[PDB]
Amino acid sequence: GEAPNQALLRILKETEFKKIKVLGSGAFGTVYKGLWIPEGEKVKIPVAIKELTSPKANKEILDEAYVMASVDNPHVCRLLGICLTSTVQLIMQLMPFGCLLDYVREHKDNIGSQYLLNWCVQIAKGMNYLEDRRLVHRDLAARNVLVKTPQHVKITDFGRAKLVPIKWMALESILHRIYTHQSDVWSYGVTVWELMTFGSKPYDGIPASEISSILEKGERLPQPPICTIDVYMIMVKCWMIDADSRPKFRELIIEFSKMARDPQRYLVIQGDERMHLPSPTDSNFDMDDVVDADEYLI
Numbered sequence: 393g394e395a396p397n398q399a400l401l402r403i404l405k406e407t408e409f410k411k412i413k414v415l416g417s418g419a420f421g422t423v424y425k426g427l428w429i430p431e432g433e434k435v436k437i438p439v440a441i442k443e444l445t446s447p448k449a450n451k452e453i454l455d456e457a458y459v460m461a462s463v464d465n466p467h468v469c470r471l472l473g474i475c476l477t478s479t480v481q482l483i484m485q486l487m488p489f490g491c492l493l494d495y496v497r498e499h500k501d502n503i504g505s506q507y508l509l510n511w512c513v514q515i516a517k518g519m520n521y522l523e524d525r526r527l528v529h530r531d532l533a534a535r536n537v538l539v540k541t542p543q544h545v546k547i548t549d550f551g552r553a554k555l556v557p558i559k560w561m562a563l564e565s566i567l568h569r570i571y572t573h574q575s576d577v578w579s580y581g582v583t584v585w586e587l588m589t590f591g592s593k594p595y596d597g598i599p600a601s602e603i604s605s606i607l608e609k610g611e612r613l614p615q616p617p618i619c620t621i622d623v624y625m626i627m628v629k630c631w632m633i634d635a636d637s638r639p640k641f642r643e644l645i646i647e648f649s650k651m652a653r654d655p656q657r658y659l660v661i662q663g664d665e666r667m668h669l670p671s672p673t674d675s676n677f678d679m680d681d682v683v684d685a686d687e688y689l690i
């Protein structure tokens with residue numbers, strides 16, 4: 393029927409890693425900054441440790457472990473392992489710049505058209521990968537895109553990934569609970585809108601119960617001021633009633649790539665290009681045996 397999933401679930405000892413501080417806490421649970429020092433390997437891996445004690449909560453986090461351990465792509469977040477304590481912990485890669493939503497709000501005055509369009513390509517690449525792996529995210533939003541470096545983003549939060557966020561949801565999903573790769577494309581359009589508005593809340597003030605009626609009337613998120621009709625038209629195509637009329641993630645990679653080659657023709661930002669963001673070629677970006685998870689293999 394379907395291919396056997398031969399992904400390895402790595403069980404890590406409590407003694408192999410340390411929590412440093414809390415990175416974030418909320419409805420999603422609690423995420424901690426940490427260091428993973430495996431065996432007698434002479435490596436220090438910067439990690440993020442997630443924990444949602446209740447049997448039903450352990451079931452849900454293990455469902456996220458299942459999906460997260462099964463993905464392997466540069467623009468998707470993979471599970472490093474799990475720790476079996478009183479509460480089951482997920483051990484993941486530290487994304488030092490946090491989520492993209494807060495990044496675009498905090499660094500607005502230094503974010504240019506090249507960065508914005510490249511993030512779009514990268515999110516579409518990650519999403520296309522999930523489509524190839526026959527996985528429907530069901531929760532794509534700017535809050536679920538993490539920043540490794542300002543030039544490298546990855547999709548996370550597999551707590552809803554299968555084979556409620558109303559304001560990011562396709563109309564078929566709100567009305568009929570129908571989720572497809574084409575419903576993820578709707579959420580992708582909303583994610584792009586969030587980036588182009590430098591982290592604006594979609595349909596601010598409007599209660600979730602009113603959204604279904606709003607979309608049925610033909611109302612969509614407005615054209616952001618920096619967006620050319622070329623970029624807005626793409627967002628609009630992601631918000632069509634007919635799912636099959638929406639672009640495919642492979643077409644979004646193409647469209648945004650063409651645009652990323654001449655970003656000033658597609659996004660109009662006051663004082664663009666003169667804008668600078670931290671790079672691994674810049675100053676101060678034990679620390680001796682530190683290795684990123686992307687370089688720490690099997």
Ligand SMILES: Cc1nc2cnc(Nc3ccnc(-c4cnn(S(=O)(=O)C5CC5)c4)n3)cc2n1C(C)C
Nearest residue numbers: 415416420423440469484485486487490491548549
């Ligand atoms: C502020 C902050 N700094 C971080 C550094 N590194 C990661 N690392 C990773 C890597 C892969 N996945 C995750 C992850 C999975 N689910 N979530 S979440 O539920 O917190 C998501 C809704 C924000 C984060 N974190 C996460 C970080 N955060 C999050 C709390 C947003």
